[PDB]
Amino acid sequence: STGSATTTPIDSLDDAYITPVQIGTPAQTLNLDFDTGSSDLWVFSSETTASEVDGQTIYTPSKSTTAKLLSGATWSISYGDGSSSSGDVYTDTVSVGGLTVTGQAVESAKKVSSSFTEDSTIDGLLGLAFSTLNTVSPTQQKTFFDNAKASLDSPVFTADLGYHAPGTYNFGFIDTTAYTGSITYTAVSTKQGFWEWTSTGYAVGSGTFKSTSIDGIADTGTTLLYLPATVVSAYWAQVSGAKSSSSVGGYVFPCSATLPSFTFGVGSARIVIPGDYIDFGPISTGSSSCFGGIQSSAGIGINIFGDVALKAAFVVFNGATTPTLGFASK
Ligand SMILES: CCN(CC)C(C)=N
């Protein structure tokens, strides 16, 4: 089997991407944030504290003939940005782009933190990291991908995120029309439960390539590109007036600037992030100070190849017995 679903930016800045997902019988369609940095599929629901729902579409398990309470199971998750959610668990039929999994754990939120409430466009998350990170207790549950894998034509999914435009998540096949050149594959460590790999270096604009190992994670659920302070300083040094602002919480730059590109290495291959991808707009409405799309990972403990990096590539998440990651230009 295969599946193919369009993913759409939630706003004009590509702050996140939502993908429609069918849950239950008859189908209830929710728009979920596909997140290769976590491993829980959770949704706003009829059980979510009413004051914490503001415009989201909810899953109502009592209206699904295939929903079954997973007795005794609870979940609780907190993300790198300080947000969180928790609740109980149902199993139900879940379909993405024509690919159907029966008996999928659907984690129903009883509580969500303010940033989720405040984002009316995201009805929940669909985790695509390794199932070892799944938070369901006392019996850990599998991701949608892990459940689907044996049925797929090939045990892979691909992320093709758009810049200020829709893109595609495919399951079970590689669309050879969706990228240019060849796909370069690179080794993955699953030791931390992430799609963790090592970039071979970077360049800033038309500058020379610096060969240096940068261990990090491919994370569709993170907006920006978080890299070591040395690398980030070298980038912003090429932008007149750019500075790190503790009050704003990162590097900012004059909105009048033209940003240089940023290149990252994948083996001997190179992925080029155009300068415009690194512009996240005024820090507040009407400001002439703009927020940078490349930021320091120094306070995080891990480097993160988030959407800013991934949207510059066609990315293969290869879930074979020994997983690997593939990157192609597009
Ligand atoms: C987990 C990231 N997130 C969704 C974009 C929020 C609202 N905190």
Short mmCIF file of C-alpha atoms and ligand atoms in Angstrom, two decimals:
data_model
loop_
_atom_site.label_atom_id
_atom_site.label_comp_id
_atom_site.label_asym_id
_atom_site.label_seq_id
_atom_site.Cartn_x
_atom_site.Cartn_y
_atom_site.Cartn_z
CA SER A 1 0.00 0.00 0.00
CA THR A 2 0.88 3.69 -0.24
CA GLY A 3 -0.49 7.03 0.92
CA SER A 4 -0.09 10.59 -0.33
CA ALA A 5 -1.35 13.73 1.44
CA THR A 6 -0.88 17.43 0.84
CA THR A 7 0.63 19.46 3.68
CA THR A 8 -0.17 23.18 3.92
CA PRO A 9 1.49 26.04 5.86
CA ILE A 10 -0.68 27.35 8.70
CA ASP A 11 0.29 30.97 8.01
CA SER A 12 2.26 33.29 5.74
CA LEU A 13 5.54 32.52 7.53
CA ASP A 14 5.43 28.69 7.35
CA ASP A 15 5.37 28.54 11.18
CA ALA A 16 4.06 24.98 10.87
CA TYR A 17 2.33 22.69 8.39
CA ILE A 18 -0.98 20.85 8.66
CA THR A 19 -2.03 17.66 6.90
CA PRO A 20 -5.58 16.29 6.84
CA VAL A 21 -6.08 12.97 8.65
CA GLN A 22 -9.22 10.81 8.72
CA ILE A 23 -10.03 9.31 12.14
CA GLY A 24 -12.87 6.95 12.98
CA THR A 25 -16.00 5.63 11.29
CA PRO A 26 -17.55 7.62 9.73
CA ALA A 27 -14.40 9.62 9.12
CA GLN A 28 -13.70 12.68 11.22
CA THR A 29 -11.12 14.78 9.40
CA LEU A 30 -8.65 16.67 11.57
CA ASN A 31 -5.70 18.78 10.44
CA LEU A 32 -2.60 17.48 12.19
CA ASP A 33 0.98 18.71 12.54
CA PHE A 34 3.19 15.85 11.26
CA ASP A 35 6.17 15.82 13.61
CA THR A 36 9.27 13.71 12.94
CA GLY A 37 10.58 14.88 16.33
CA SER A 38 7.94 13.15 18.50
CA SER A 39 6.02 9.88 18.57
CA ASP A 40 2.51 10.56 19.85
CA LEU A 41 -0.60 10.95 17.70
CA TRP A 42 -2.82 13.20 19.80
CA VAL A 43 -5.91 15.25 19.04
CA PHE A 44 -8.21 17.91 20.39
CA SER A 45 -11.34 16.02 21.37
CA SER A 46 -14.75 16.04 23.03
CA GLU A 47 -12.80 15.38 26.26
CA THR A 48 -10.61 18.49 26.03
CA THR A 49 -11.24 21.08 28.75
CA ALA A 50 -13.73 23.44 27.11
CA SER A 51 -11.89 26.65 28.00
CA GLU A 52 -8.79 25.23 26.27
CA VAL A 53 -10.54 24.75 22.91
CA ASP A 54 -10.70 27.82 20.64
CA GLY A 55 -11.61 27.02 17.04
CA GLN A 56 -9.99 23.60 16.65
CA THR A 57 -11.83 20.67 15.10
CA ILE A 58 -12.32 17.96 17.72
CA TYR A 59 -12.38 14.18 17.60
CA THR A 60 -15.50 12.73 19.25
CA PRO A 61 -14.86 9.03 19.90
CA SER A 62 -18.46 8.36 20.96
CA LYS A 63 -19.47 9.14 17.36
CA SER A 64 -17.02 6.60 15.91
CA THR A 65 -18.26 3.03 15.66
CA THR A 66 -14.67 1.75 15.48
CA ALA A 67 -13.35 3.67 18.52
CA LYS A 68 -12.42 1.63 21.59
CA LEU A 69 -11.16 3.01 24.89
CA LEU A 70 -7.68 1.67 25.64
CA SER A 71 -8.41 0.80 29.24
CA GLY A 72 -6.13 2.38 31.82
CA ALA A 73 -3.90 4.14 29.30
CA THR A 74 -2.85 7.76 29.78
CA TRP A 75 -0.35 10.03 28.06
CA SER A 76 1.49 13.24 28.82
CA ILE A 77 4.00 15.05 26.65
CA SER A 78 6.01 18.25 26.73
CA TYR A 79 7.79 19.71 23.73
CA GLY A 80 11.02 21.65 23.26
CA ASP A 81 9.17 24.97 23.15
CA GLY A 82 7.67 24.41 26.60
CA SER A 83 4.19 23.45 25.36
CA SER A 84 2.39 20.34 26.58
CA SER A 85 -0.74 18.19 26.45
CA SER A 86 -2.12 15.08 28.16
CA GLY A 87 -5.13 12.79 28.33
CA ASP A 88 -6.38 9.25 27.72
CA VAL A 89 -6.29 6.90 24.74
CA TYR A 90 -8.56 5.26 22.20
CA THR A 91 -7.75 2.90 19.37
CA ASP A 92 -9.44 3.69 16.06
CA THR A 93 -9.02 3.59 12.30
CA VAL A 94 -6.72 6.31 10.99
CA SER A 95 -6.14 7.13 7.32
CA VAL A 96 -3.63 9.49 5.73
CA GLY A 97 -3.84 10.19 2.02
CA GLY A 98 -5.53 6.86 1.29
CA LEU A 99 -3.32 4.73 3.57
CA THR A 100 -5.33 3.12 6.38
CA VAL A 101 -4.19 1.77 9.74
CA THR A 102 -6.66 -0.07 11.97
CA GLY A 103 -6.15 -0.13 15.74
CA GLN A 104 -4.05 3.04 15.81
CA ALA A 105 -3.59 4.63 19.22
CA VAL A 106 -5.35 8.00 19.10
CA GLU A 107 -4.44 10.02 22.16
CA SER A 108 -7.35 12.18 23.26
CA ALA A 109 -6.39 15.44 24.96
CA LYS A 110 -8.01 16.28 28.28
CA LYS A 111 -5.61 19.20 28.75
CA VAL A 112 -3.50 21.32 26.38
CA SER A 113 -1.22 24.28 27.11
CA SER A 114 -1.95 27.83 26.02
CA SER A 115 0.06 27.80 22.78
CA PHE A 116 -2.06 24.92 21.47
CA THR A 117 -5.31 26.62 22.47
CA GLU A 118 -4.10 29.80 20.80
CA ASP A 119 -3.41 28.06 17.48
CA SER A 120 -6.82 27.43 15.96
CA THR A 121 -5.34 25.83 12.83
CA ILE A 122 -3.72 22.80 14.48
CA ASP A 123 -6.10 20.06 15.67
CA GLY A 124 -3.30 17.87 17.05
CA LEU A 125 0.02 16.19 16.23
CA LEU A 126 0.99 13.04 14.37
CA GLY A 127 4.37 11.80 15.59
CA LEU A 128 6.79 10.21 13.13
CA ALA A 129 9.91 9.73 15.27
CA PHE A 130 10.67 6.29 16.71
CA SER A 131 8.05 4.58 18.84
CA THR A 132 10.48 4.32 21.77
CA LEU A 133 9.58 7.98 22.52
CA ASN A 134 5.83 7.37 22.70
CA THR A 135 4.48 8.58 26.05
CA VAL A 136 1.50 6.25 26.55
CA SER A 137 1.57 4.51 29.93
CA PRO A 138 1.57 1.76 31.11
CA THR A 139 1.72 0.23 27.62
CA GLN A 140 3.72 2.21 25.08
CA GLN A 141 2.04 2.57 21.69
CA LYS A 142 3.33 2.54 18.11
CA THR A 143 3.37 5.45 15.66
CA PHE A 144 1.21 5.57 12.55
CA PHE A 145 4.30 4.83 10.45
CA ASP A 146 5.36 1.88 12.60
CA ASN A 147 1.86 0.40 12.35
CA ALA A 148 1.67 0.94 8.58
CA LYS A 149 5.19 -0.18 7.75
CA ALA A 150 4.67 -3.89 7.04
CA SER A 151 1.83 -3.04 4.65
CA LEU A 152 3.77 -0.39 2.71
CA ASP A 153 5.26 -1.10 -0.72
CA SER A 154 8.56 0.16 0.74
CA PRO A 155 9.16 0.96 4.43
CA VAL A 156 9.64 4.70 3.94
CA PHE A 157 7.93 8.06 4.13
CA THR A 158 9.00 11.30 2.46
CA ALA A 159 8.66 14.96 3.43
CA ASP A 160 8.44 17.54 0.66
CA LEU A 161 7.65 20.80 2.45
CA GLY A 162 6.91 23.94 0.47
CA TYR A 163 8.26 27.45 0.89
CA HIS A 164 5.18 29.63 1.33
CA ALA A 165 3.30 26.90 -0.57
CA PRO A 166 1.75 23.46 -0.11
CA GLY A 167 3.86 20.31 -0.19
CA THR A 168 3.47 16.57 0.24
CA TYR A 169 3.92 13.70 2.67
CA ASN A 170 4.13 10.33 0.93
CA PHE A 171 4.08 6.92 2.58
CA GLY A 172 5.47 3.75 1.07
CA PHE A 173 7.03 5.08 -2.13
CA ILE A 174 9.56 7.59 -3.44
CA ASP A 175 8.18 9.99 -6.07
CA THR A 176 11.06 10.26 -8.52
CA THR A 177 9.43 13.30 -10.20
CA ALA A 178 9.53 15.32 -6.96
CA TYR A 179 13.28 16.04 -6.82
CA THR A 180 16.25 16.90 -9.03
CA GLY A 181 19.51 15.00 -9.27
CA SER A 182 20.03 12.06 -6.92
CA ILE A 183 19.10 11.34 -3.32
CA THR A 184 22.11 11.16 -0.99
CA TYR A 185 21.58 8.80 1.92
CA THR A 186 23.24 9.21 5.29
CA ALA A 187 23.38 7.16 8.50
CA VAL A 188 20.86 7.50 11.32
CA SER A 189 21.23 6.91 15.04
CA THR A 190 18.02 5.93 16.83
CA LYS A 191 19.70 6.01 20.25
CA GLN A 192 17.73 9.11 21.33
CA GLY A 193 14.58 8.07 19.47
CA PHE A 194 15.04 10.73 16.75
CA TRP A 195 15.99 10.76 13.07
CA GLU A 196 19.48 11.78 14.17
CA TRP A 197 22.24 12.19 11.60
CA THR A 198 25.52 14.03 11.02
CA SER A 199 25.84 16.84 8.51
CA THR A 200 29.26 17.13 6.88
CA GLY A 201 29.48 20.93 7.11
CA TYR A 202 28.18 24.27 5.91
CA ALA A 203 28.69 27.38 3.82
CA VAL A 204 27.34 30.92 4.15
CA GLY A 205 26.26 32.56 0.91
CA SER A 206 28.92 32.22 -1.77
CA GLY A 207 31.56 31.45 0.87
CA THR A 208 33.81 28.41 1.00
CA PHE A 209 32.42 25.18 2.45
CA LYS A 210 33.57 24.37 5.98
CA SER A 211 33.99 20.64 6.53
CA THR A 212 32.82 19.91 10.06
CA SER A 213 30.57 17.28 11.63
CA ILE A 214 27.23 18.58 12.89
CA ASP A 215 25.10 16.01 14.67
CA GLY A 216 21.41 16.89 14.64
CA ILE A 217 17.84 15.75 14.07
CA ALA A 218 15.51 15.99 11.10
CA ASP A 219 12.44 17.50 12.73
CA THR A 220 9.43 18.55 10.69
CA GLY A 221 7.76 19.73 13.91
CA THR A 222 10.34 22.46 14.54
CA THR A 223 10.00 25.67 12.53
CA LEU A 224 13.58 26.92 12.48
CA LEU A 225 17.15 25.69 11.97
CA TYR A 226 19.07 25.41 15.26
CA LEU A 227 22.84 25.00 14.94
CA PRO A 228 25.96 25.51 17.07
CA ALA A 229 26.70 29.07 18.16
CA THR A 230 29.89 29.19 16.07
CA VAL A 231 27.99 28.37 12.87
CA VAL A 232 25.12 30.74 13.60
CA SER A 233 27.50 33.61 14.45
CA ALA A 234 29.30 33.07 11.14
CA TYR A 235 25.99 33.26 9.26
CA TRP A 236 24.63 36.44 10.86
CA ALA A 237 28.01 38.18 10.64
CA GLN A 238 27.26 38.40 6.89
CA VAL A 239 24.09 40.42 7.50
CA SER A 240 24.65 44.11 8.23
CA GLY A 241 22.93 45.12 11.46
CA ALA A 242 22.13 41.57 12.59
CA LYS A 243 22.47 40.90 16.30
CA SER A 244 21.46 38.44 18.98
CA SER A 245 18.79 39.93 21.21
CA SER A 246 18.21 38.32 24.60
CA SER A 247 15.01 40.36 24.96
CA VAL A 248 13.57 39.01 21.69
CA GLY A 249 15.06 35.53 22.19
CA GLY A 250 17.45 35.13 19.29
CA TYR A 251 19.06 36.69 16.25
CA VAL A 252 17.18 39.55 14.62
CA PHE A 253 18.10 41.55 11.53
CA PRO A 254 16.97 44.68 9.67
CA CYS A 255 13.89 43.84 7.60
CA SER A 256 15.50 45.85 4.77
CA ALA A 257 18.32 43.27 4.48
CA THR A 258 18.80 40.76 1.69
CA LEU A 259 19.75 37.52 3.44
CA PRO A 260 22.50 35.22 2.18
CA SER A 261 21.82 31.55 1.49
CA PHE A 262 22.96 28.79 3.85
CA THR A 263 24.31 25.49 2.58
CA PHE A 264 24.48 22.27 4.60
CA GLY A 265 26.33 19.09 3.72
CA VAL A 266 24.84 15.63 3.35
CA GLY A 267 27.81 13.38 2.67
CA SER A 268 29.49 14.84 -0.40
CA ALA A 269 26.21 16.49 -1.47
CA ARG A 270 25.01 20.00 -0.66
CA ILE A 271 21.56 21.41 0.13
CA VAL A 272 21.16 25.16 -0.39
CA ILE A 273 18.65 27.09 1.74
CA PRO A 274 17.81 30.33 -0.10
CA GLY A 275 18.15 33.51 1.94
CA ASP A 276 14.43 34.25 1.75
CA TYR A 277 13.71 30.99 3.63
CA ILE A 278 15.57 32.43 6.62
CA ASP A 279 13.29 35.51 6.94
CA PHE A 280 10.55 35.08 9.58
CA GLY A 281 9.30 38.63 9.40
CA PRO A 282 8.78 41.49 11.84
CA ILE A 283 9.29 40.57 15.51
CA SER A 284 6.03 42.39 16.21
CA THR A 285 3.49 43.94 13.86
CA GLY A 286 4.91 47.04 12.18
CA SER A 287 8.47 46.52 13.42
CA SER A 288 11.46 46.96 11.12
CA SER A 289 13.34 44.31 13.08
CA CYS A 290 12.89 40.84 11.60
CA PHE A 291 13.35 37.44 13.24
CA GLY A 292 16.02 35.10 11.90
CA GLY A 293 15.33 31.56 10.72
CA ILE A 294 18.73 30.27 11.83
CA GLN A 295 19.25 30.31 15.59
CA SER A 296 21.68 28.94 18.16
CA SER A 297 21.12 25.48 19.62
CA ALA A 298 23.37 26.28 22.60
CA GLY A 299 20.49 26.27 25.10
CA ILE A 300 18.76 23.18 23.68
CA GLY A 301 21.32 20.39 23.93
CA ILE A 302 20.76 19.20 20.37
CA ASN A 303 21.02 20.63 16.86
CA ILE A 304 17.73 20.68 14.96
CA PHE A 305 17.28 20.61 11.21
CA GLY A 306 13.75 22.02 11.31
CA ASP A 307 11.46 23.21 8.53
CA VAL A 308 13.80 26.00 7.37
CA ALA A 309 16.31 23.32 6.36
CA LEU A 310 13.97 20.49 5.40
CA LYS A 311 11.79 22.61 3.06
CA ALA A 312 14.89 23.19 0.89
CA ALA A 313 15.01 19.44 0.21
CA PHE A 314 13.12 16.31 -0.71
CA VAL A 315 13.66 14.19 2.40
CA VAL A 316 13.42 10.39 2.66
CA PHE A 317 12.80 8.87 6.08
CA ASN A 318 13.90 5.28 5.46
CA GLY A 319 12.47 2.94 8.10
CA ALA A 320 14.26 -0.20 6.95
CA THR A 321 15.76 -2.50 9.60
CA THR A 322 18.72 -0.11 9.67
CA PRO A 323 17.12 3.30 9.21
CA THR A 324 18.71 6.01 7.06
CA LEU A 325 17.88 9.54 5.86
CA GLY A 326 17.99 10.69 2.25
CA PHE A 327 18.21 14.27 0.95
CA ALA A 328 17.80 15.58 -2.58
CA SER A 329 17.60 19.06 -4.03
CA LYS A 330 14.31 19.95 -5.72
C1 LIG B 1 4.64 21.77 19.39
C2 LIG B 1 4.66 23.02 18.55
N1 LIG B 1 3.34 23.69 18.52
C3 LIG B 1 2.56 23.54 17.28
C4 LIG B 1 3.14 24.32 16.14
C5 LIG B 1 2.88 24.41 19.56
C6 LIG B 1 1.56 25.09 19.42
N2 LIG B 1 3.43 24.59 20.69
#
